Design a protein around this ligand. Structure first.
Ligand SMILES: Nc1nc2c(ncn2[C@@H]2O[C@H](COP(=O)(O)OP(=O)(O)OP(=O)(O)O)[C@@H](O)[C@H]2O)c(=O)[nH]1
Ligand SMILES: [Mg+2]
Ligand SMILES: [Zn+2]
Ligand SMILES: [Zn+2]
Lengths: 197, 148, 49, 343, 199, 50, 65, 348, 103
RNA sequence: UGCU
C-alpha cells in the first residue's frame, strides 16, 4: 500500500501528464469563500502551447454537473454545450466562467486574479518513483566481460554510452573519463611479456 | 534652494495611444512661460487628473528647502518641514538620459531629459537654458500641484 | 492504456505477476456515450479532484 | 477625489471585471502621510468586536470587525492544523478475514474521529509503543458475520440473509485503562457519528482488532483535524453609484443573490436596494449586462471577516477557537521564554 | 473532417520526428567519430593525432566561439563603451574633443601590452574610435560646443561626454576580453564542432 | 552490442543511479538534490588525513 | 471499492451518509434534491457521493464466504 | 586508510540525461541530501537537459577519484557552462513560470506597499544571502502613499546589498517593441537598465530567456564573472514564484471565449474567402485563369487558395488580438514569451 | 534551540538581525510580521522559508537607528500576546451573551 | 513490452 509522494506520475485524461513536484499542507493550499481547498494545482503555462480547451470545457461541465446533481456528456462532435453549463452555474450562484474569488492561504490576502477551480478526473499511472529509483554499488558483474549487469532487477548499473563518451571528450575531462571507463568499470592488472609482447 | 526647474504646465492629451495601463497614464503637457514639453507617466489611481487640468511642477535636487543635500536615506516616518508639504504629488526619480534634438540638422538648441521614476518615464524637452543643472546619474525629486 | 484502476469483480481472486489497484475509484463526472457503452463507469480507473 | 480614493484603497477591496485591486494591507506607519497608522492598543480594543450570527451543533458563524487579514489567516491555519485531537494511530489485528485490505481498514479507522476530550490527555513521547494510561485510548472491534438462523426462503436482501454484515463504527467498545473508567463517565468516550460504515462482511468472515489512539495535531496528519471546514471571508458591501429603478431593479435582483437585492414600490415604481450583503457571494454575474456595469460597485470590507467553522463533532467550535487562541498564546509565550533565556 | 485532417498532420509530424531522431543520431555518431581526433595545441595550430596540421590558426583568428559576445564578433564596442560610461562616471573631469580623443587613443594603443594583440582587433578599435569621435564632432558642430571648455551651458557637454579615464578603462576592458576569449590550448575543438553540428 | 561499441566505447559502470526528476526552485543552479536512500548506497572513498 | 469516510478536499464525514443516500435513491428523491437534503452545500461532498461506485458487494459476491 | 563515506553535502556529482545531444546534457553539480526520493534541481537548467518533468529518468554518477572530482567541478561546472559552444547563446536562463512572473512584476501597473516590498525582498534572503544587507531602495511615490515599484523590487535582485560590486548595464528592445518610440514605446517594451537598476522596459524572453544575446544574465556573466550571474539567477528563481503565487495567475474558458465583433469579422472573412475561392474555381473550370510564372494552372489555383486561407487566418488572428482585453493570461504569456504565441492563440 | 539569533556579518552589527525559528510555519511568521511592521522604529521586516521539507523559518529585521532589533522583536511578541488575550476575552464574552440571549 |  503506497501513498502518492514526490515523483509519482499523474494524468488528467487529456495527455497533460505530470509528476508530483511538491506536497503543500492544507493550511498552505488556498481557500475560496466556501472554504474548499484544491487537491491538485496544475501549471496554466501548459494550456497556450497545447491548445487544450477540451480540458477547460470538461472542468466547467464537471463543475456544473456536481452542482446540479447531473452527469454531463463530453461526446465527440457534440455533447453538452458551454451555454448550458454557464446557465447551470449562474442558476446555482457560481461564476459563469469557472473563475471564483479565492483568498491566498499563505499571506491571507485576496489574489489580484481569480483562480479557475473545478472538478477534473485525474487518473494515476503505474509509473512509480519507488519502482524507478535505482542506486548501484559495486555489486556483481558479468562472467564474459567483468562489467555491471544491465537490468535493475538483476542489479545493473548505468551505461555511459557513446554519446556520454563524446560529451566527456568535448569537455576534456581526461582523468574523469579514465576513472569512469577504466578504473570504476573494468579495472584489472595483467602481465605482459616485454620480449614477445 | 535646490530647485533645478519650475514651471506651470497644462495637459493637452491623456492617452494618445489608448488606455494601455489602468493605474498609470502618459500625459502630454506644454508650458506657458516657455516652449517646454513634458511627456510624463503619472499615477491616476492615487492622483486623478483630467484633460483641461493645469499644474505647477518643480524638479529639485533635494526635498528640503534649507539646502541640505543629505539624502543618503529617506525615512517616511520622520516629520519635519520639507518641500513636499507645499505640493500634493511627490515622486523620486533619477535623470537617466540627456539627448539633444535630432529634428534640427543645424543650429539646434533643444535638449530633452529622460528621467525614470521607478519605471515611470518623464521626458522634459525644451531649450537647454532651462535644463541647467540636470546631469546624468543624478537623483531628483518631482513635485506636482494642481491649480484652480 | 496504462491507467491504474480496477480490472474486474474477480480482481481479488485473480493472481497475476503484477497488478495495480486503486483504493477509492470514482466514475468520471463528464462521461461519454462510448464510456456508457463499454461500461467503464462500472470499473473506473481514476478519481475526480 | 484623492482623499476618497485613498480611503477606498485603505478600507475596501474592489473586485474588477478582469481582476481584483487593492488586495494588499497597507495600513502601516510611513505608507500614508495624512494617516497615523502606528500601532495603538487603545484604538485596537475600541474598534475590535465579535458578533456571533449563527451557532449550532458542529457549526459556528461569527463576524470579527477590527482584525487584520494576517491574524485572520493565522487563526484559520491554527484551527485547521495546530489544534490537537484524538485519532486512531496503531491497529493490532487478529485473524482478519475481511475482503477489505488490512492497510485500507487501518486507514479508514484512523480517519474515524473520536469524541474524547484532548485537553485531558498528553502527547506520547518518542517511542513507547506500549502506551500509558495518560496518553492512550483503546477501542476494541470484534465483529463475526454469520447467516441468520431465521430468514425467508428467498431472502434476496443481505439485511435479512445475514446479520452484522455491515461493520459500523458503533460496534467499537472503549476499553478503559487504569482509572480512566472512573475519570470519564460511561457514554463519553465513543465514536462521534456512531453510523460510519467501516466495511462489509459475509458469513464466515470476522474482523477482530484493537485500536490505540493518542494525541496529535493536524499538521502531522489530516486525521487529527477537528474542523471539517474552517474558513473566513471578507464582508461584502454592495453600493449603487446611481439610483436604479424599473425593470433594471428586477434585473439587479436576478443578477445578484436573491437575498441581497430587494425591490420596493415607494412611489408605484420598482426600485432596488441592498437588503443584506451577507447572503451575496459575489458571483460577478452583473458584468454580463452591459448597461448595469457602471451602476454598481462591488467591494469587500478589509476590517470585517465572517468566520465560518463547521467541525466534525469532536468538540464545539467555540471551544475549538478558544483552544486555537490558547495554542497561539502558548507559542508566543514559548518564544518569549526562549528569547529571555538567550538574553 | 477537420479533426481527421488535424490528426493526419499530427501523425505526420510524429513520424517525421521519429525518423529525425535516428537520422540525427547516426549523423552525430559519424561526425563525432570523424572529428574526435583534432585538438588545439599551444602554438595556436590545430593538429590531428598523427601530427598533421589541419589549421595554422583556428577560425583564422583564434577566438573561442563560446566566448563570442557579438554576432560572430568578439565584442560589441557600442555596448562595452556604454557599460564603461555607466560604470565609471567621472564628474570631476572635462569632456574630450575629436582631436584629444584620437591623440589619447593613439598614445594608449602604442603601449607594450597592446603589441601582442592581433592587428585586426586594433584596426577595429581604431575604426570605432574614429566613428565615435566623428559623432562627437558632429554633435558639437550642431550645438556650438567649444573644445576650450568655457561654454556657458554645461548641459551641452552631457550629450556625448567622454573622459580619458573612461577611454583607458574601455581600452583595457576590450584588451582583456579579447585576450580571454582566445582559444585555450588543449580543448577538444573537433568534438565541440561535431556536437554543435549534430545538435 | 559488440566489443568495440558494446564493451569498449560504451560500457556500464558502478556507483551510479537512475531516478525520476522533479522541480525544486529553492536550490541553486549549480546544486542538485540527492535522496537519502541513494546517498546511503553511493559511497565515496575518502583518505584519512590530518 | 467502498465509500471513503473522509472527503478529499475538505474532510467532512461522508461515509456515514452512504446508506442514507442509497435510501434516498430507493425513494423518489433525485440526486440533486437528495444531496441537498443530506446537508451537502459545497460541491466537493456532492461529487464525492455522486461519482462513487459501489463495488464492495460485487467483490463480496466473489468472496470465499 | 580509506573510508567509504556516504554522499554528503558539498560533493561533486555528475547529472545527465540518457539522450545526449550536446555536451551540456551532462553537468557536475553539488549534491545536497533531502528526505524525498527524486533528483531535484533548479528549473533554469532544464533547457540544457531538455527535460520537461513528465516522467523523465535521469542518471546520477559519483566520481571515485579526487582528480576526476576536481576536473568535473571545474570543466563541467554549471556556472562555467552557462553558454553553449555552438553560437555562445546562454541556455541556462529563465523558463516558463519565471518569465511571466518577472513580466507581471516589472509591469508598470505594479505598486507595492512597504510590507509587501519587504516580504518580496526577504523571500530570497536564504542560504549565502543571509549574510548581506537588504538595502531597501527608496520609494518612488511617497507623498500620496509610499509605494515601491516592481522594477525596483527586481533591481534589488541585481543589487541586493551595498557592498555588491555588480553594476549591470543593458539597452535593448523587447518583443512587442513598436520601432519608433526609442525608449518611449507606448507598450514600454524597451529594456534599459543602468547600474543594476531597471530604468525602463519590462522583462520577457528576449531579456531573461535563453533565446539569443542581450540577456541580463549573459551580461552579468560576461562582466562580473560566473558567481554573480549564478546568484542573480538563484535570487530570481526564489523571488518570482513567491510574487506569482501571492498575485495569482490562472486561465479559464472566459480567457479564450470569442467576442461578438470577433465572430462577426470571422463570418465576414469566411464569406469573402469562400466567394473568392468559388470565383477562382469557376474561372479555372470554365474559361482561362491567370497562370502564375513557373507553375501550372492547378498549382496556381492551389497557391491562390492557400494565400486566401492564410489571409483569412491572419485577419482573424489580428481581430482576436485587437478585441482581447489586457490582463488575459494567454495574451500575457504570448507577450512575455514564456509559452504559446499569437498563432496558437488565434488557432484556439 | 528553537529560536536563534544571527548578526548581518562578522562585524556583529545589531541594526540588522536574523531570527531563525524551528518547528514553525507561515502562521506565526506572518502574525509577528504584521504585529511588528507597525513599529515606527523598523526599516525592514521580512519572513521567509528555507525549504518546504524542513520546518523552519527565517525572519529578518533591520531597524532605523541604533535599535538592537531584539527589543522590537520582544515588543511584537508582547503585542501579539496582548491581542490574542483580548480577542479570546471578546470571543468568550460574545459566546456567553449569545447563549444567554438564546436561552 | 513499456517509459523519457
Ligand atoms: N517488454 C519487452 N518486450 C519485447 C522487447 N523486445 C521485444 N519484445 C517483444 O518482441 C516484439 C518486438 O521485438 P523485436 O524488436 O522484434 O525484438 P528484436 O528485433 O530482437 O529486438 P532486438 O532484441 O533489439 O533485436 C514486440 O512486438 C514484443 O512482442 C522488450 O525489449 N521489452
Ligand atoms: Mg519528457
Ligand atoms: Zn615472452
Ligand atoms: Zn467534502
Amino acid at each position: 500500500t503506497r501513498r502518492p509522494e514526490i515523483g509519482d506520475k499523474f494524468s488528467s485524461r487529456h495527455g497533460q501528464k505530470g509528476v508530483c513536484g511538491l506536497i503543500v499542507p492544507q493550511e498552505d493550499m488556498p481557500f475560496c469563500d466556501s472554504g474548499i481547498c484544491p487537491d491538485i494545482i496544475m501549471n496554466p503555462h501548459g494550456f497556450p502551447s497545447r491548445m487544450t480547451v477540451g480540458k477547460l470545457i470538461e472542468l466547467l461541465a464537471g463543475k456544473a454537473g456536481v452542482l446540479d446533481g447531473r452527469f454531463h456528456y463530453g461526446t465527440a462532435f457534440g455533447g453538452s454545450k458551454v451555454k448550458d453549463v454557464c446557465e447551470d452555474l449562474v442558476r446555482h450562484g457560481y461564476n459563469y466562467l469557472g473563475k471564483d474569488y479565492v483568498t491566498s492561504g499563505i499571506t491571507g490576502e485576496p489574489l489580484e486574479a481569480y483562480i479557475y477551480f473545478g472538478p477534473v478526473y485525474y487518473q494515476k499511472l503505474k509509473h512509480m518513483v519507488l519502482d524507478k529509483m535505482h542506486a548501484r554499488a559495486r555489486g556483481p558483474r558479468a562472467v564474459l566481460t567483468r562489467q555491471p549487469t544491465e537490468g535493475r532487477s538483476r542489479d545493473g548499473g548505468l551505461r555511459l554510452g557513446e554519446m556520454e563518451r563524446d560529451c566527456l571528450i568535448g569537455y576534456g575531462a581526461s582523468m574523469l573519463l579514465l576513472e569512469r571507463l577504466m578504473i570504476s568499470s573494468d579495472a584489472f592488472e595483467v602481465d605482459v611479456c616485454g620480449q614477445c609482447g | 534652494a535646490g530647485i533645478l526647474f519650475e514651471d506651470i504646465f497644462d495637459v493637452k492629451d491623456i492617452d494618445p495611444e489608448g488606455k494601455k495601463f489602468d493605474r498609470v497614464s502618459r500625459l502630454h503637457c506644454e508650458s506657458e512661460s516657455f516652449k517646454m514639453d513634458l511627456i510624463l507617466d503619472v499615477n491616476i489611481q492615487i492622483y486623478p487628473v483630467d484633460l483641461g487640468d493645469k499644474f505647477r511642477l518643480v524638479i529639485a535636487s533635494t526635498l528640503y528647502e534649507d539646502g541640505t543635500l543629505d539624502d543618503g536615506e529617506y525615512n517616511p516616518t520622520d516629520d519635519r518641514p520639507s518641500r513636499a508639504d507645499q505640493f500634493e504629488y511627490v515622486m523620486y526619480g533619477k535623470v537617466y538620459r540627456i539627448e539633444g534634438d535630432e529634428t534640427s540638422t543645424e543650429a539646434a538648441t533643444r535638449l530633452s531629459a529622460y528621467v525614470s521614476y521607478g519605471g515611470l518615464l518623464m521626458r522634459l524637452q525644451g531649450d537647454a537654458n532651462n535644463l541647467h543643472g540636470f546631469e546624468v546619474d543624478s537623483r531628483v525629486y518631482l513635485l506636482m500641484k494642481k491649480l484652480a | 492504456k496504462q491507467a491504474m484502476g480496477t480490472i474486474g469483480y474477480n480482481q481479488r481472486n485473480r493472481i497475476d505477476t503484477l497488478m495495480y489497484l486503486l483504493a477509492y475509484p470514482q466514475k468520471p463526472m463528464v462521461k461519454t456515450k462510448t464510456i456508457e457503452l463499454i461500461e467503464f463507469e462500472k470499473l473506473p480507473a481514476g478519481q475526480n479532484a | 477625489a484623492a482623499s476618497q480614493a485613498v480611503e477606498e484603497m485603505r478600507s475596501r477591496v474592489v473586485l474588477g471585471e478582469f481582476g481584483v485591486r487593492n488586495v494588499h494591507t497597507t495600513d502601516f506607519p510611513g505608507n500614508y502621510s495624512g494617516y497615523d497608522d502606528a500601532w495603538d492598543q487603545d484604538r485596537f480594543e475600541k474598534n475590535f468586536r465579535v458578533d456571533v450570527v449563527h451557532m449550532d451543533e458542529n457549526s459556528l458563524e461569527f463576524d470579527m470587525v477590527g482584525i487584520d487579514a494576517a491574524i485572520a489567516n493565522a487563526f484559520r491555519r491554527i484551527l485547521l492544523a495546530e489544534v490537537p485531537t484524538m485519532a486512531v494511530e496503531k491497529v493490532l489485528v487478529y485473524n482478519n478475514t475481511s475482503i477489505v485490505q488490512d492497510e485500507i481498514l487501518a486507514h479508514r479507522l484512523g480517519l474515524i474521529p473520536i469524541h474524547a476530550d484532548p485537553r485531558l490527555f498528553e502527547y506520547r513521547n518518542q517511542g513507547d509503543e506500549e502506551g500509558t494510561e495518560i496518553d492512550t485510548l483503546q477501542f476494541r472491534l470484534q465483529v463475526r458475520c454469520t447467516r441468520n438462523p431465521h430468514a425467508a426462503k428467498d431472502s434476496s436482501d443481505p439485511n435479512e440473509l445475514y446479520v452484522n454484515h455491515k461493520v459500523y463504527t458503533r460496534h467499537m467498545t472503549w476499553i478503559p485503562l487504569g482509572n480512566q473508567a472512573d475519570l470519564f463517565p460511561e457514554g463519553t468516550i465513543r465514536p462521534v457519528h456512531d453510523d460510519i460504515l467501516i466495511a462489509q462482511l459475509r458469513p464466515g468472515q470476522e474482523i477482530d482488532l484493537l485500536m490505540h489512539c493518542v494525541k496529535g495535531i493536524g499538521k502531522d496528519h489530516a486525521k487529527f483535524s477537528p474542523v471539517a471546514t474552517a474558513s473566513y471571508r471578507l464582508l461584502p458591501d454592495i453600493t449603487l453609484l446611481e439610483p436604479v429603478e424599473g425593470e433594471a431593479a428586477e434585473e439587479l435582483s436576478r443578477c445578484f443573490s436573491p437575498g441581497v437585492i430587494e425591490v420596493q414600490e415607494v412611489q408605484g415604481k420598482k426600485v432596488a436596494r441592498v437588503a443584506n450583503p451577507r447572503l451575496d457571494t459575489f458571483s460577478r454575474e452583473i458584468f454580463r449586462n452591459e448597461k448595469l456595469k457602471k451602476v454598481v460597485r462591488l467591494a469587500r470590507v478589509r476590517d470585517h471577516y465572517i468566520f465560518s467553522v463547521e467541525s466534525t463533532g469532536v468538540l464545539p467550535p467555540d471551544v475549538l477557537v478558544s483552544e486555537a487562541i490558547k495554542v497561539l498564546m502558548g507559542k508566543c509565550r514559548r518564544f518569549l521564554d526562549e528569547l529571555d533565556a538567550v538574553q | 473532417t477537420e479533426f481527421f485532417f488535424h490528426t493526419m498532420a499530427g501523425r505526420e509530424g510524429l513520424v517525421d520526428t521519429a525518423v529525425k531522431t535516428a537520422e540525427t543520431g547516426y549523423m552525430q555518431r559519424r561526425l563525432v567519430k570523424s572529428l574526435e581526433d583534432l585538438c588545439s595545441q599551444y602554438d595556436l595550430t590545430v593538429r590531428s593525432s598523427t601530427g598533421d596540421i589541419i589549421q595554422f590558426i583556428y577560425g583564422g583568428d583564434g577566438l573561442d566561439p563560446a566566448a563570442m559576445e557579438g554576432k560572430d564578433e568578439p565584442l560589441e564596442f557600442k555596448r562595452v563603451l556604454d557599460n564603461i560610461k555607466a560604470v565609471f562616471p567621472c564628474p570631476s573631469e572635462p569632456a574630450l574633443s575629436k582631436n584629444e580623443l584620437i591623440l589619447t587613443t593613439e598614445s594608449i594603443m602604442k603601449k607594450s601590452e597592446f603589441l601582442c594583440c592581433q592587428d585586426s582587433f586594433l584596426q577595429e578599435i581604431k575604426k570605432f574610435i574614429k566613428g565615435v569621435s566623428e559623432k562627437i564632432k558632429k554633435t558639437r558642430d550642431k550645438y556650438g560646443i567649444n573644445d576650450n571648455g568655457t561654454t556657458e551651458p554645461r548641459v551641452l557637454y552631457q550629450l556625448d561626454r567622454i573622459t580619458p579615464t573612461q577611454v583607458e578603462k574601455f581600452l583595457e576592458t576590450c584588451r582583456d576580453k579579447y585576450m580571454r576569449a582566445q582559444m585555450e590550448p588543449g580543448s577538444a575543438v573537433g568534438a565541440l564542432c561535431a556536437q554543435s553540428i549534430g545538435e | 552490442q559488440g566489443r568495440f561499441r558494446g564493451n569498449l566505447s560504451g560500457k556500464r559502470v558502478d556507483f551510479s543511479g537512475r531516478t525520476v526528476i522533479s522541480p525544486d526552485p529553492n536550490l541553486r543552479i549549480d546544486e542538485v538534490a540527492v535522496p537519502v536512500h541513494v546517498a546511503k548506497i553511493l559511497t565515496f572513498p575518502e583518505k584519512v588525513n590530518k | 471499492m467502498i465509500i471513503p469516510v473522509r472527503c478529499f478536499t475538505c474532510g467532512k464525514i461522508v461515509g456515514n451518509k452512504w446508506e442514507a443516500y442509497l435510501g434516498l435513491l430507493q425513494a423518489e428523491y433525485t440526486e440533486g434534491d437528495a444531496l441537498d437534503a443530506l446537508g451537502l452545500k459545497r460541491y466537493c461532498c456532492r461529487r464525492m457521493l455522486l461519482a462513487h461506485v459501489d463495488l464492495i458487494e460485487k467483490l463480496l459476491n466473489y468472496a470465499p464466504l | 586508510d580509506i573510508v567509504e563515506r556516504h554522499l554528503i553535502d558539498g560533493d561533486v556529482v555528475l547529472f545527465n540525461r540518457q539522450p545526449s545531444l550536446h555536451k551540456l546534457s551532462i553537468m557536475a553539480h553539488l549534491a545536497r541530501v533531502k528526505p524525498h526520493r527524486t533528483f531535484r534541481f533548479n528549473e533554469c537548467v532544464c533547457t540544457p537537459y531538455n527535460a520537461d518533468f513528465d516522467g523523465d529518468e535521469m542518471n546520477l554518477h559519483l566520481p571515485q577519484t579526487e582528480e576526476a572530482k576536481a576536473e568535473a567541478l571545474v570543466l563541467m561546472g554549471t556556472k562555467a557552462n552557462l553558454v553553449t559552444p555552438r553560437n555562445g547563446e546562454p541556455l541556462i536562463a529563465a523558463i516558463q513560470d519565471f518569465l511571466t512572473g518577472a513580466y507581471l512584476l516589472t509591469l508598470k501597473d505594479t505598486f507595492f506597499d512597504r510590507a509587501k516590498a519587504c516580504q518580496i525582498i526577504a523571500s530570497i534572503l536564504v542560504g549565502k544571502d543571509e549574510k548581506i544587507k537588504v538595502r531597501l531602495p527608496p520609494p518612488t511615490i511617497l507623498k500620496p502613499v509610499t509605494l515601491w515599484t516592481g522594477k525596483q523590487i527586481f533591481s534589488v535582485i541585481l543589487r541586493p546589498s551595498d557592498d555588491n560590486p555588480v553594476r549591470a548595464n543593458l539597452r535593448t528592445k523587447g518583443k512587442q517593441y513598436c520601432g519608433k518610440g526609442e525608449d518611449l514605446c507606448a507598450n514600454d517594451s524597451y529594456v534599459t537598465i543602468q547600474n543594476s537598476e531597471l530604468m525602463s522596459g519590462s522583462m520577457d524572453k528576449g531579456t531573461l530567456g535563453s533565446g539569443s544575446k542581450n540577456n541580463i544574465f549573459y551580461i552579468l556573466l560576461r562582466d562580473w564573472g560566473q558567481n554573480e550571474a549564478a546568484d542573480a539567477m538563484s535570487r530570481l528563481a526564489r523571488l518570482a514564484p513567491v510574487y506569482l503565487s501571492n498575485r495569482g495567475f490562472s486561465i479559464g474558458i472566459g480567457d479564450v471565449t470569442p467576442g461578438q465583433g470577433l465572430l462577426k469579422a470571422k463570418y465576414e472573412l469566411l464569406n469573402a474567402g469562400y466567394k473568392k475561392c468559388d470565383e477562382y474555381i469557376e474561372a479555372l473550370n470554365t474559361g482561362k485563369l491567370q497562370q502564375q510564372p513557373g507553375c501550372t494552372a492547378e498549382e496556381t489555383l492551389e497557391a491562390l487558395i492557400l494565400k486566401e486561407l492564410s489571409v483569412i487566418r491572419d485577419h482573424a488572428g489580428s481581430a482576436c488580438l485587437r478585441e482581447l482585453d489586457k490582463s488575459n493570461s494567454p495574451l500575457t504569456m504570448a507577450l512575455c514569451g514564456s509559452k504559446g504565441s499569437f498563432i496558437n492563440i488565434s488557432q484556439m | 534551540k528553537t529560536a536563534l539569533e544571527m548578526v548581518q556579518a562578522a562585524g556583529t552589527d545589531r541594526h540588522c538581525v536574523t531570527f531563525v525559528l524551528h518547528e514553525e510555519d507561515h502562521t506565526l511568521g506572518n502574525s509577528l510580521r504584521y504585529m511588528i511592521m507597525k513599529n515606527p522604529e523598523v526599516e525592514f521586516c521580512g519572513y521567509t522559508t528555507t525549504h518546504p521539507s524542513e520546518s523552519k523559518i527565517n525572519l529578518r529585521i533591520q531597524t532605523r537607528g541604533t535599535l538592537p532589533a531584539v527589543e522590537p522583536f520582544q515588543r511584537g511578541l508582547n503585542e501579539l500576546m496582548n491581542v490574542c488575550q483580548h480577542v479570546l476575552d471578546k470571543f468568550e464574552a460574545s459566546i456567553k451573551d449569545y447563549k444567554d440571549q438564546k436561552a
